[PDB]
C-alpha cells in the first residue's frame, strides 16, 4: 500500500532527480507495490 | 428402572412424570417446560450419564425436590463440551444438585440466569476452568454454616476463596482425605472399582455410579466374557447389547461391540462382520457411518444428490450417476462423491459433466447384494473418459454385469476390468460393445514429439512435426505446473472439466513449421501438452486424433527476474540484515541473491481513553467529506502527471540462498540502497534479476557523544572561549554542537554550528558574572545527540 | 504560432519552451517539472480550452511571468469538472494567471504549500455555481497575508467586489483580478472600461470589434468572431477554419480522426450520436440509429473471439473494420459475457465466421445489423462448431453482409434451418455454392424437427405440479427411455427452451427427471416438488432421449412451454407492517407478500388483545466511557446464548418440521387502517392474503401489531376532585373514573400540600373504587390544597382542578 | 433479525401456551424471520 502525499515523496525516491483512470495511486496504494514498479513511473 | 437411552422432556411440566421410572439415565436429560403450574411437585430420588439441559423451566427455583441423589454427571457425551449448562433459565434461583460429586467426562457451563461461588466446581470438575452468572453482588450466597447457622456443609478453598453448597436448602459434600480421586462414602472409602460414590463402604454391589461399568449388580473394570461394557455406567450381557435395535441415542441394529466396549460403531478401521455385533473386521478405511440412506435405491443426477451421500463409507443399495448439468463440478464431486468406500449393489448414464469418475477416489470395491433387470450392477449416453482411474485405483464388482454402449469413454477401460474388476464374462460382448462406444473423444490418438523448445525471457516457441486426412488446423498448445504429476484430462474444456489453460495458433500451409508463442508464460514455472484439434468424420471411428506428450519445458521456467518482498533491517551498528522472501518472480530455482549496497550530502552540514477530555469525531463520514475529497483529487493527479515519463562506491555478496543474511563493515550511521538481485541458473546468460529497499545502520555510539572534554579559556568582555574535539567518524553528521553553561549549574544552553566551531577551534561565552561558573558540550549527531563532555567548572572576570 | 491541440510539457523546465509556439491552446496544458532550477525564465505572453494543470513544479512560486495574458479557458473538455487544477504544488505561493476572467465550461480546484490570492479572486464571476470550487483546504487565510496592489498598504488599485458576503480587493502580491462591470456584463469586457463585440466573451483585441475578440464567445473564423461562414464548421476550440482543415487533420493527440468527419455544423473529431461517416469524407454524416458509441476498428484489421477476453476488446462499439470469427471453445454460461462483449457492435468491414461450444446461439450479437464485408477470409462460414444452435435470431434480428458468402458443414448442434431457409433473410441466395451449406454432417445433433408433446393432464397443489404428457411413442419405443420436466420461475411468454440449458446452453431452466413407464397403458407423470412461490412456473417437458440407428435422423421431442399459478394456491404473506397512525385507528401495510399465487385481496383479522390482571392490581472520545476492543468475551457470552437456540431450539415441541375477532377485505392497495378500535389496546393484525382460490383452499398462512394511540381525555381524570373533612386532621379525596381509560388507570396519582403540593402518592384502582378517591392525615390546621391524576396504562393522566381544602385543630 | 434474550420473549409470546452451532436462532436472528415461522417452532 502506498498513496496520498507520501506516494509523491515515494516517487521522489524511486525516480531520484533524474527528471483507464486507475493509476499508481489506484494500484500501489490500492493493492501493494515494491520499489520496482514505483520507479517504473520514471524515465531511463 | 434404569431410564434407558436418554430423555427429551418437552412441551409441559407433565413430562417430568416419566423420571419416576429413571434410576440412572443411560443418556442425556433435556428439560421449554415454561409452566409455573408446578415447581418442586416432580421429585425423583430414583435419578442418580450425559449432558443435562436446564433452561425455560418456569416454576423451577431449586432441584432439591426434582433430581435428588445425583451421584455424578458421568458426562460421556457433551452437546459441545459441557454436561450441566444452566443458561437464561426462567427463574432458577439455586442449582440445588446437593449430591453432585463429579463430571467424569468434559465440564459444565452455569452462567447468566434469572436469579441463580460457594460450590467448589474445581472439586466436582478437576479445576472449574465453565462460564461461572446473574449479578454476583446479588448472589447473597448463604447456606446453613456460611450464614448465622454454625458450619454445616463441607468447606474448601480455590484461587484463595475459602467458603462453605449447591443451594441454601441442602448443601455440598466432597471426597475427603479418606480417598480423594477414588469415589468416597458417608468418613469411609469406596471400592477399588468405583468413582463418585458407593451405598456402602468398599463394596462392588454398593457402587452407586461404578468407576467403569456396574455389570449385573457388581462394579467390574471390564465386562465379563459373553457380556460387553454399555458406554455409560453399567455393563450388560451380550444378548442385551446386540438385541437393542434403536432408541434415539440408540441406533445400531445391535451395537457392534468394539473399542473394548458395547459401542454403537467400531473404532477407526473396523466394519461389522456381515450382521454380527459380536465383533468388528479391521477395515483399514475409517468409517464415518454405514453410508446407507432410508431409500434403498439412490441416484446422483444432481450435485445436491452427490452431496447427500458425502461423509460416510459402506452404503446398502446403489449409486447411479446421471449429472448432465455441471462445469468443473470435478471439485464438487471430489468433495461429495469421494468418501463412499463400499456399496451393497452398484454405481450405474447421460452425465456429460464428468470427464472421468476419479472424483470417487475412495470407492475401493463394490459388493453387489442388490442388482437391476438383467443384473446390470452400467454406462449409456454418458459422453466420461477414464472410469475409476485404473492406473492408481482398481475396483471389484462381486455381483454385477458391465454394460458400455453409446459412451463416445474407451472400451479398453472395461476390457481391463474383465480381469481387474473380475467381470471376465458376467456380461456379454454386446453389453460392452465397441459400436457407438468410444467413437468420439480420443484414445488411440498418437503422441507427437516436440521438434524445438526455444525459451526466451517470457516466450516458449514450442514446435512439432499430419492427421488421417490433411483437410484438418488450430493447434491448441494447452499450457499451465511446478510438479510433473499432470495428465491431459485434468480439466479439458466444459464437458471435460476445466484447468488446462487452452491457447491456439493455426498450423501454417508443407514448408514453414508450426511455432506458437505462449508469450507471457508464468514467470517462475514451466507443462505444454500440444494436442492437435482436428475434424473427426468420414473415417469417423478410424480418425485416430493426436495428443503430444506433456513436456514441462524443463528450462527452470524462463530466466532470472525481479526479486520481491525484500525486508532489509539494520540488525546491529555498522550492520544490515537482508532477510527477503523466495521472490514472487525469481524466474528459475533461486540460485543465490547478490546483495548490492552503496550519497550522504552536505545540506544539514550548513544548518474510552480520556472520558471527558478529547472531542466528538464520530462524524468521520463528514471528516471523509474532505478525506474522500482528497481521494477525488487523487484521480486527477495520480493518473496523469509523470506517466509521460514511461559520492560512495558499490559492494556485493552472493548470499548462499537462505532468506536471512547480514551486511557488516558499514559506516557508523548511513542509509544504504540495499538492492536484492536473485542471480538464478542462467543470470550470466540472460541478465541478473531486475533490481530494492533502504535502511540506516544503527548508530555506532562513541561518535554520537563528544570524544573528549572541554577547555574553558578566559576572554575579554567577560567572555570564556570553550573548546572540544570533533567526533572522528560521526553518526551521519554532527549537525550542531550543543553547549551548556551557567553560574550555579549549566542553566543556559545554545549550539555552535560545526562550521563556526571548526573556524573558532571551539565556541565563546559572553557577559558572565565575575565568580565560579560551570560549562559542558554535546555532539548533535544525525542519529541523535550523545552524552555531554566532562565537567567544565570555569570562572569569569571583568578586570 | 496558434497552439496545436494539447500540451504535455514533461521532465524539465526546458519543455516549457514549447509554449513559445502556443498563442491559444486548443486542448489542455500539463506542466512534474520539479527541478528547482528556473522560476520565471519561461514567460509566454502569446498564450491567452481544457484542464490547465499547474502542479509539481519546484521553483515555480507564481505564473506572473509564465503564461501572461491568460484571457479565458473555453473549457471545451475537462478532466473531471475543472479547466484549471492546482493540487498541492511543490511550492506555489501565488497562482499568477493575472488575466484569467472566465473558465467558460467548468470550475477550478486550487490544499497547497503557501498558495494565496484565491478568496480575493472573484471566482463566482470566473464561473457560476462557485460551489464546484474546493479552495477550502488551501493553506490558512492567516498565512495568506493578501498584499495585492491596494490591499497591501498603498492607495486602492485592484478590483473591489464580493463572493457570497466576502467583499475584499487580485491574482498575486504584484497583480490584480479584473472582471466585467455594468459596461458589458455577460458580454466580454475591454480596457478603457469599453464593451466587447456583440458576439464575444472574455476579451477583445480592440474595444467592441468583430475582427478583434482575443478569445471569441464562439468561433473567431479567419479573424472574425462568428456566432457559427462559407464552407466553415463551428470549430471545437476558439477560432474557426474551412472544411479542408477538418478533412486534412488525421491525428494530433486531442486530434485522432483521419479526416475529422464534419456534422452538427461543427469541425469535430467525429459526428455526434446517430450518424455514420458519409463514405470516407468530411462532407457530412449519415443519419442512422445510434451507430456512434465509437469506431469499433482496432489497429489489427483482422480479429476473432477465441477467448472471452478476445470478445471483451470489441465491447462498447459499433463500426468494426475486419471480422468477428467466433472460436470460443469453452466459457461457462458466457451467453451473458458475450451478450455485452459481442453485442453493441453494429457493422463489421469483413465478415463473421469455427470450433466454438461455449455459447449455444449467436443472439449474444443483439445490435449487429449489417456487415460492410470490405475484407474477405474468401468465405465472408461455420465448421466443427456445435453448441451454437440458432444463429442471429432471424425472426427478431435480420442480418445481411453487403459482401458475403455462406458455408455450413460438420456443425452438430448448429441447425441447418438457420441458413437453408434464412439465405433469404441474409440476402445470400447465390453468393456461394450449394455444396458449401451441405447436409453431410451439418446439423447431426441439435433440436432438429423435434415434435411437440401435448400435456395430457396439468394438475395443481398448494406448491406442486403433476404435469403429465402423452406417453411418447417415437419410431422405436425402446430408443425412448427417460424424460426431463425443465421448469423455471417465469410468468412471461417471452421465454424459449435454449434460454439456459446446461453450461454451454447457459443456466436458467432448473431441469429435473422421471422415467417414462415401460407399460404402454401407464403414462409418464412427474411429481414436480416445491414450485417457486408467488410465480406461475413455466413447465416445458423435453424428451431428453438417446440416439441410435437413425442417430441424426432421430426427430426428437419437446412439448411447447405451456406456462402452467393456478397450479399453486393461497399461502403465507410477508413484510406485513403496522403502526397506530391515530387513536382508535391502526395503519397496516404489506410489502407485496412474497402467497404461491396471484393476490386477490388482504382479509385482515384483529381483536382487542385481552389484558391480564397483574397491572390492574399494582473518533468521539469527547466523553468516551469504554471502547475496549476486548468485547470477544461478549461473543463467548453469545456462544451458547446462540447455540441454546440451536440446542433445545430444534427438537422439543416439534416445530412443524375474552374478545371477538373483526375482519375486512382490502381490495389490493398495499395499505389500510383499522379504524373504530378501542382507545388503547394491542391488535394482532393477522394479514390474510386471500388469493384467487382462498375461499376454496384457506385464506393465506396468517402478522404484526401496534397499541392504538392513547385517546387523550381517557388518560386524565374526567373531572375535578371533591374534598370532605375527616378525623385525625384528615380530608377524604374524591375523583371520577374515565369512560374508556387508555388500557386502564393502573395508579391514581395524588398531589397535596399547603404552601406547595410537593407531597405526592398514588391510590390503587381497587382502593379508589371502594373509597371514592383517597383519605389524607396530619394536615396542619389551616387552608391547604389537593389534586389527583389518572396514571393510565399508556402513561400519566393530568392533575385535577385545585382542591383548596382546610382542617381545624378542634 | 431476532435472537438473544429478546428472542426468548419473542418465541414465548408467539408460542401462546403450547410453549451444534446452527438452528432456529441461526436464521430468524442470522437472516430475517416473521411471526409465522417463529411460531412454527411452537406446539399447538
Coordinates of C-alpha atoms in Angstrom, one line a residue, chain B residues 215-679:
Chain B
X215 CA -22.1 -55.3 35.4
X216 CA -25.3 -57.1 36.7
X217 CA -25.1 -55.6 40.2
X218 CA -21.2 -55.6 40.6
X219 CA -18.7 -52.8 39.6
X220 CA -16.5 -54.7 37.0
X221 CA -13.5 -52.7 35.4
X222 CA -14.0 -54.7 32.1
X223 CA -17.2 -56.6 31.1
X224 CA -17.2 -60.4 31.8
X225 CA -17.0 -63.0 28.9
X226 CA -20.2 -63.0 26.6
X227 CA -21.0 -59.6 28.2
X228 CA -20.0 -56.0 27.0
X229 CA -19.5 -52.6 28.6
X230 CA -22.5 -50.4 27.7
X231 CA -20.9 -47.0 27.2
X232 CA -22.5 -45.2 30.3
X233 CA -22.4 -46.5 33.9
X234 CA -23.5 -50.3 33.9
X235 CA -22.3 -53.3 31.9
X236 CA -24.9 -55.6 30.1
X237 CA -24.9 -59.2 28.8
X238 CA -24.0 -59.9 25.0
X239 CA -27.8 -60.6 24.3
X240 CA -29.0 -57.2 25.6
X241 CA -26.2 -55.2 23.8
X242 CA -27.0 -56.9 20.4
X243 CA -30.8 -57.3 20.8
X244 CA -31.2 -53.5 21.3
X245 CA -32.1 -52.2 17.8
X246 CA -32.8 -48.4 18.2
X247 CA -33.9 -45.9 20.9
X248 CA -32.9 -42.3 19.8
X249 CA -29.4 -42.2 21.2
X250 CA -29.5 -46.0 20.4
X251 CA -29.4 -46.6 16.6
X252 CA -27.2 -49.7 15.7
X253 CA -29.2 -52.8 14.9
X254 CA -27.0 -54.5 17.6
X255 CA -24.4 -52.0 19.0
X256 CA -21.4 -53.6 17.1
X257 CA -19.1 -54.5 20.2
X258 CA -15.6 -53.0 19.6
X259 CA -13.1 -50.5 21.2
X260 CA -13.3 -52.9 24.2
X261 CA -17.0 -51.9 24.8
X262 CA -20.6 -52.5 23.7
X263 CA -20.2 -49.4 21.3
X264 CA -22.8 -48.4 18.6
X265 CA -20.0 -48.4 16.0
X266 CA -16.3 -49.7 16.0
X267 CA -13.1 -47.5 16.3
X268 CA -11.1 -46.3 13.2
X269 CA -10.7 -49.1 10.6
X270 CA -13.3 -51.8 11.6
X271 CA -16.6 -52.9 9.8
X272 CA -19.3 -55.1 11.5
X273 CA -18.7 -58.7 10.2
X274 CA -21.8 -59.3 8.0
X275 CA -24.6 -58.7 10.5
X276 CA -22.8 -59.9 13.7
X277 CA -22.4 -57.3 16.6
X278 CA -20.2 -59.9 18.4
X279 CA -17.0 -58.2 17.0
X280 CA -15.8 -55.9 14.0
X281 CA -13.5 -56.7 11.0
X282 CA -10.4 -54.5 10.6
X283 CA -11.5 -52.1 7.7
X284 CA -8.2 -50.1 7.4
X285 CA -10.5 -47.4 6.0
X286 CA -12.0 -45.4 8.9
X287 CA -15.8 -45.4 8.5
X288 CA -17.8 -42.1 9.4
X289 CA -21.0 -44.3 9.4
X290 CA -22.8 -47.0 7.4
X291 CA -23.5 -44.7 4.4
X292 CA -26.9 -46.4 3.6
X293 CA -29.9 -44.0 3.1
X294 CA -33.5 -44.8 4.1
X295 CA -34.3 -45.1 0.3
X296 CA -32.7 -48.4 -0.8
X297 CA -32.2 -47.2 -4.4
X298 CA -30.0 -44.0 -4.7
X299 CA -29.1 -41.9 -7.8
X300 CA -26.7 -38.9 -8.2
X301 CA -28.2 -36.9 -11.2
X302 CA -27.8 -33.6 -9.2
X303 CA -24.7 -32.0 -7.4
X304 CA -27.0 -31.8 -4.3
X305 CA -27.6 -35.6 -4.6
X306 CA -23.8 -36.1 -4.8
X307 CA -23.6 -34.1 -1.5
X308 CA -26.4 -36.1 0.2
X309 CA -24.0 -39.1 0.4
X310 CA -20.8 -37.1 1.5
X311 CA -19.4 -38.1 4.9
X312 CA -19.7 -41.9 5.1
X313 CA -18.3 -45.3 3.6
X314 CA -20.4 -48.6 3.2
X315 CA -23.8 -47.8 1.6
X316 CA -26.5 -50.6 1.4
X317 CA -28.1 -50.0 -2.1
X318 CA -26.5 -48.3 -5.2
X319 CA -25.0 -45.0 -6.6
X320 CA -26.5 -44.4 -10.2
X321 CA -24.8 -41.3 -11.8
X322 CA -26.9 -39.0 -14.2
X323 CA -25.4 -35.4 -13.7
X324 CA -25.9 -33.8 -17.2
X325 CA -25.5 -30.1 -16.0
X326 CA -22.2 -29.2 -14.3
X327 CA -18.9 -27.5 -15.3
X328 CA -15.6 -28.1 -13.3
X329 CA -18.0 -29.9 -10.8
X330 CA -15.0 -32.3 -10.8
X331 CA -14.0 -30.5 -7.5
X332 CA -17.7 -30.6 -6.3
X333 CA -17.8 -34.4 -6.7
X334 CA -14.2 -34.9 -5.5
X335 CA -15.5 -33.5 -2.2
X336 CA -19.1 -35.0 -2.4
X337 CA -18.7 -38.5 -4.2
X338 CA -15.2 -39.2 -2.8
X339 CA -15.8 -41.0 0.5
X340 CA -18.1 -44.0 -0.2
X341 CA -15.7 -47.0 0.0
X342 CA -18.2 -49.9 -0.5
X343 CA -21.9 -50.3 -1.6
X344 CA -24.1 -53.5 -1.5
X345 CA -25.1 -53.1 -5.2
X346 CA -23.5 -50.9 -7.8
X347 CA -22.6 -47.4 -9.2
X348 CA -24.5 -47.0 -12.5
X349 CA -25.6 -42.8 -17.8
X350 CA -26.4 -39.4 -19.6
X351 CA -23.9 -37.4 -17.5
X352 CA -21.7 -35.1 -19.7
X353 CA -20.4 -33.1 -16.5
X354 CA -17.8 -35.8 -15.7
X355 CA -14.6 -36.2 -17.8
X356 CA -13.6 -39.2 -15.5
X357 CA -15.0 -40.8 -12.3
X358 CA -11.7 -40.0 -10.5
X359 CA -13.9 -37.9 -8.1
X360 CA -14.6 -41.3 -6.5
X361 CA -11.0 -41.8 -5.2
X362 CA -12.4 -43.6 -2.0
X363 CA -14.6 -46.3 -3.7
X364 CA -12.2 -49.3 -3.2
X365 CA -14.6 -52.0 -4.3
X366 CA -18.4 -52.7 -4.9
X367 CA -20.3 -55.7 -3.4
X368 CA -23.5 -56.3 -5.4
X369 CA -26.1 -57.6 -2.9
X370 CA -28.8 -55.8 -4.9
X371 CA -28.9 -55.8 -8.8
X372 CA -31.1 -54.4 -11.7
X373 CA -33.1 -56.1 -14.6
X374 CA -30.6 -58.5 -16.3
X375 CA -28.4 -58.0 -13.1
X376 CA -26.8 -54.8 -14.5
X377 CA -24.8 -53.7 -11.4
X378 CA -23.7 -49.8 -16.4
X379 CA -22.9 -46.7 -18.6
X380 CA -25.1 -45.5 -21.6
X381 CA -25.3 -42.0 -23.3
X382 CA -22.6 -40.6 -20.9
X383 CA -20.1 -38.9 -23.4
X384 CA -16.6 -39.8 -19.3
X385 CA -13.0 -40.8 -20.5
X386 CA -11.3 -42.8 -17.6
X387 CA -13.8 -44.7 -15.3
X388 CA -12.2 -45.2 -11.8
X389 CA -8.5 -44.1 -12.6
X390 CA -7.4 -47.8 -13.2
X391 CA -3.7 -46.7 -13.2
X392 CA -3.9 -45.9 -9.4
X393 CA -7.4 -47.2 -8.2
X394 CA -8.7 -50.7 -9.1
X395 CA -12.3 -51.8 -8.0
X396 CA -14.1 -55.1 -8.0
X397 CA -17.8 -55.9 -8.7
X398 CA -18.7 -59.1 -6.6
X399 CA -22.2 -59.3 -8.2
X400 CA -22.7 -57.1 -11.3
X401 CA -22.6 -57.4 -15.1
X402 CA -20.9 -54.5 -17.0
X403 CA -22.7 -52.5 -19.8
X404 CA -20.9 -49.9 -22.1
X405 CA -22.6 -48.6 -25.3
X406 CA -23.3 -45.0 -26.7
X407 CA -20.4 -43.6 -24.5
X408 CA -18.1 -41.8 -27.1
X409 CA -15.2 -43.5 -22.6
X410 CA -12.7 -46.1 -24.0
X411 CA -13.9 -49.8 -24.4
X412 CA -10.3 -50.7 -23.1
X413 CA -11.2 -49.1 -19.7
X414 CA -13.7 -52.1 -19.3
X415 CA -11.8 -54.7 -21.3
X416 CA -9.2 -54.1 -18.4
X417 CA -11.9 -54.6 -15.8
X418 CA -12.7 -58.1 -17.4
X419 CA -9.6 -59.3 -15.4
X420 CA -9.1 -56.4 -12.8
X421 CA -12.7 -56.0 -11.5
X422 CA -13.3 -59.8 -12.2
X423 CA -16.1 -59.2 -14.8
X424 CA -14.4 -61.6 -17.3
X425 CA -17.8 -62.7 -18.6
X426 CA -20.5 -61.6 -16.1
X427 CA -21.8 -59.6 -19.1
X428 CA -21.9 -60.4 -22.9
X429 CA -19.7 -58.8 -25.6
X430 CA -22.8 -56.9 -26.8
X431 CA -23.1 -55.3 -23.3
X432 CA -19.6 -53.7 -23.6
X433 CA -20.0 -53.3 -27.4
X434 CA -17.5 -51.2 -29.5
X435 CA -20.2 -49.8 -31.9
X436 CA -21.0 -46.1 -30.7
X437 CA -18.8 -46.6 -27.6
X438 CA -15.5 -44.5 -27.8
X439 CA -16.4 -43.4 -31.4
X440 CA -15.5 -39.7 -30.5
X441 CA -13.3 -38.4 -27.7
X442 CA -9.7 -39.7 -28.2
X443 CA -7.7 -42.8 -27.2
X444 CA -5.5 -44.3 -30.0
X445 CA -4.6 -40.6 -30.7
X446 CA -0.8 -40.6 -31.5
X447 CA 1.6 -38.7 -29.1
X448 CA 3.6 -36.1 -31.2
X449 CA 7.2 -35.2 -30.1
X450 CA 8.5 -31.5 -29.7
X451 CA 10.9 -30.5 -32.6
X452 CA 12.2 -27.4 -30.7
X453 CA 11.6 -26.0 -27.1
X454 CA 13.1 -22.5 -27.6
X455 CA 12.8 -20.5 -24.4
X456 CA 13.4 -16.6 -24.4
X457 CA 12.6 -14.3 -21.3
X458 CA 8.8 -15.0 -21.2
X459 CA 8.1 -16.8 -24.6
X460 CA 8.1 -20.6 -25.2
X461 CA 8.3 -21.1 -29.1
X462 CA 7.3 -24.8 -28.8
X463 CA 7.1 -26.5 -32.3
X464 CA 6.3 -30.1 -33.5
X465 CA 6.3 -32.2 -36.8
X466 CA -0.3 -34.7 -40.1
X467 CA -3.8 -36.2 -39.1
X468 CA -5.5 -39.1 -41.0
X469 CA -6.8 -36.6 -43.7
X470 CA -5.0 -33.3 -44.2
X471 CA -8.3 -31.3 -44.5
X472 CA -7.6 -31.0 -40.8
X473 CA -5.6 -26.7 -38.2
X474 CA -5.9 -24.8 -34.8
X475 CA -3.1 -26.4 -32.7
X476 CA -4.2 -25.9 -29.1
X477 CA -0.9 -25.6 -27.2
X478 CA -2.8 -26.2 -23.9
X479 CA -0.3 -24.8 -21.3
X480 CA -0.4 -24.4 -17.4
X481 CA 2.9 -26.9 -13.5
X482 CA 5.6 -26.8 -10.8
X483 CA 5.2 -30.7 -10.3
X484 CA 5.4 -33.5 -13.0
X485 CA 2.1 -35.1 -11.8
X486 CA -0.3 -33.8 -14.6
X487 CA -2.2 -35.7 -17.4
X488 CA -4.4 -34.2 -20.3
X489 CA -7.9 -34.7 -18.8
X490 CA -7.1 -32.7 -15.5
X491 CA -9.7 -30.2 -16.9
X492 CA -10.1 -30.2 -20.7
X493 CA -12.9 -27.7 -21.7
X494 CA -16.5 -27.6 -20.2
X495 CA -17.7 -31.3 -20.5
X496 CA -14.1 -32.5 -19.7
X497 CA -13.8 -30.1 -16.6
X498 CA -11.6 -27.0 -16.9
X499 CA -8.0 -26.2 -15.7
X500 CA -5.5 -26.8 -18.6
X501 CA -5.3 -23.2 -20.0
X502 CA -6.4 -23.5 -23.7
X503 CA -4.2 -21.5 -26.1
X504 CA -4.2 -21.6 -30.0
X505 CA -2.2 -20.9 -33.3
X506 CA -3.0 -22.3 -36.7
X507 CA -0.6 -24.8 -38.5
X508 CA 0.9 -22.9 -41.5
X509 CA 0.3 -24.3 -45.0
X510 CA 4.2 -28.1 -46.4
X511 CA 7.2 -25.7 -45.8
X512 CA 7.0 -23.3 -42.7
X513 CA 6.8 -25.4 -39.5
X514 CA 4.1 -24.5 -36.8
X515 CA 5.6 -22.4 -33.9
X516 CA 3.1 -21.0 -31.4
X517 CA 4.3 -18.3 -28.9
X518 CA 2.9 -18.8 -25.3
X519 CA 4.1 -15.1 -24.8
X520 CA 3.5 -14.1 -21.2
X521 CA 4.3 -17.6 -19.8
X522 CA 4.1 -17.8 -15.9
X523 CA 7.4 -16.3 -14.7
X524 CA 8.9 -18.9 -12.1
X525 CA 7.3 -22.1 -13.7
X526 CA 7.3 -24.2 -16.9
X527 CA 3.6 -28.0 -18.9
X528 CA 2.9 -27.6 -22.7
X529 CA 0.9 -30.6 -24.0
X530 CA 0.4 -29.6 -27.7
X531 CA -2.8 -31.5 -28.5
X532 CA -3.9 -31.5 -32.2
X533 CA -7.7 -30.5 -32.5
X534 CA -8.9 -32.0 -35.9
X535 CA -12.2 -32.8 -37.8
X536 CA -13.4 -36.3 -36.7
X537 CA -15.7 -37.7 -39.6
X538 CA -15.5 -39.6 -43.0
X539 CA -13.1 -42.1 -41.4
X540 CA -15.2 -41.3 -38.2
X541 CA -14.0 -44.3 -35.9
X542 CA -10.7 -44.6 -37.9
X543 CA -9.9 -40.9 -37.2
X544 CA -7.0 -41.6 -34.7
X545 CA -6.5 -38.0 -33.5
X546 CA -3.4 -36.7 -31.6
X547 CA -2.2 -35.7 -28.0
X548 CA 1.5 -34.5 -27.8
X549 CA 3.4 -35.6 -24.7
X550 CA 3.3 -33.4 -21.6
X551 CA 6.9 -32.0 -21.5
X552 CA 7.3 -29.5 -18.5
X553 CA 9.7 -27.4 -20.8
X554 CA 12.5 -28.0 -18.1
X555 CA 14.5 -24.8 -18.6
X556 CA 13.8 -23.7 -14.9
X557 CA 10.7 -21.7 -16.2
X558 CA 12.3 -18.8 -18.2
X559 CA 15.3 -16.9 -16.6
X560 CA 16.3 -14.6 -13.7
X561 CA 14.0 -11.8 -12.7
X562 CA 12.9 -9.0 -10.2
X563 CA 13.2 -10.2 -6.6
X564 CA 10.2 -9.5 -4.2
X565 CA 9.2 -8.9 -0.6
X566 CA 12.7 -7.9 0.4
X567 CA 13.0 -6.9 4.2
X568 CA 16.4 -5.3 4.9
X569 CA 16.8 -4.2 8.5
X570 CA 19.9 -2.8 10.4
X571 CA 20.2 -5.7 13.0
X572 CA 23.4 -4.1 14.5
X573 CA 25.5 -0.9 14.4
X574 CA 27.5 -0.8 11.0
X575 CA 25.5 -4.0 10.2
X576 CA 22.4 -4.7 7.9
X577 CA 20.4 -8.0 7.8
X578 CA 18.8 -8.5 4.3
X579 CA 16.1 -11.1 5.1
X580 CA 13.7 -11.3 2.0
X581 CA 11.3 -14.0 0.6
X582 CA 11.6 -16.6 -2.3
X583 CA 10.7 -13.7 -4.6
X584 CA 7.3 -13.8 -6.4
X585 CA 9.4 -13.7 -9.6
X586 CA 13.0 -15.4 -9.3
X587 CA 12.2 -17.0 -12.8
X588 CA 14.2 -20.2 -12.1
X589 CA 15.2 -22.3 -9.0
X590 CA 16.5 -19.4 -6.7
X591 CA 20.4 -20.0 -7.1
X592 CA 21.6 -17.0 -4.8
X593 CA 20.9 -13.3 -4.0
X594 CA 23.7 -10.8 -5.0
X595 CA 23.0 -8.0 -2.3
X596 CA 24.1 -4.7 -3.9
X597 CA 24.5 -1.7 -1.5
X598 CA 26.2 1.7 -1.5
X599 CA 25.1 9.8 -1.3
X600 CA 25.2 11.4 2.3
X601 CA 25.1 15.1 1.0
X602 CA 26.2 18.2 3.0
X603 CA 22.8 20.0 3.3
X604 CA 22.2 19.5 7.1
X605 CA 26.0 20.3 7.5
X606 CA 25.2 24.0 7.0
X607 CA 22.1 24.0 9.4
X608 CA -13.0 5.0 26.5
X609 CA -9.5 6.5 26.8
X610 CA -9.8 10.0 28.4
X611 CA -13.6 10.2 29.4
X612 CA -14.1 14.0 29.3
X613 CA -11.0 15.5 27.5
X614 CA -11.0 14.8 23.7
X615 CA -13.7 15.8 21.1
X616 CA -16.5 14.1 19.1
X617 CA -15.1 13.0 15.8
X618 CA -17.9 10.4 15.4
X619 CA -18.7 12.4 12.2
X620 CA -15.8 10.5 10.4
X621 CA -18.0 10.4 7.3
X622 CA -18.1 14.3 7.5
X623 CA -14.3 14.1 8.1
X624 CA -14.3 12.0 4.9
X625 CA -16.2 14.8 3.1
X626 CA -12.7 16.3 2.7
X627 CA -10.8 12.9 3.1
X628 CA -12.8 11.2 0.3
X629 CA -12.5 14.6 -1.5
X630 CA -8.7 14.1 -1.1
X631 CA -9.2 10.8 -3.0
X632 CA -11.2 12.6 -5.8
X633 CA -8.2 15.0 -6.1
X634 CA -6.1 11.7 -6.3
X635 CA -7.7 10.6 -9.6
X636 CA -6.9 13.9 -11.5
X637 CA -3.2 13.8 -10.4
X638 CA -2.3 10.1 -10.0
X639 CA -3.5 9.0 -13.4
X640 CA -1.8 11.9 -15.3
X641 CA 1.5 13.7 -14.3
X642 CA 4.7 11.5 -14.6
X643 CA 3.1 8.8 -16.7
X644 CA 4.5 10.9 -19.6
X645 CA 7.8 9.6 -18.2
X646 CA 7.3 5.9 -19.2
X647 CA 29.8 10.1 -3.6
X648 CA 30.4 6.4 -2.4
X649 CA 31.1 3.1 -4.4
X650 CA 29.1 -0.2 -4.5
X651 CA 29.9 -3.6 -2.9
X652 CA 28.3 -7.1 -3.5
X653 CA 27.9 -10.6 -1.7
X654 CA 26.3 -13.7 -3.4
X655 CA 24.1 -15.0 -0.4
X656 CA 24.1 -18.8 -0.3
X657 CA 20.2 -19.0 -0.7
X658 CA 18.8 -18.8 2.9
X659 CA 16.4 -15.8 3.3
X660 CA 18.4 -14.2 6.1
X661 CA 22.0 -12.6 5.6
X662 CA 23.9 -9.6 7.0
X663 CA 26.0 -6.6 5.6
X664 CA 28.6 -5.7 8.2
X665 CA 31.7 -3.3 8.0
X666 CA 29.4 -0.4 7.1
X667 CA 29.7 3.3 8.3
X668 CA 28.6 4.3 11.9
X669 CA 25.2 5.7 10.6
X670 CA 24.5 5.9 6.8
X671 CA 21.4 4.8 4.7
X672 CA 22.2 2.0 2.2
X673 CA 20.4 1.3 -1.1
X674 CA 20.2 -2.4 -0.1
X675 CA 19.2 -3.7 -3.5
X676 CA 18.4 -7.5 -3.9
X677 CA 19.3 -9.5 -7.1
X678 CA 18.2 -13.2 -7.4
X679 CA 21.0 -14.2 -9.9

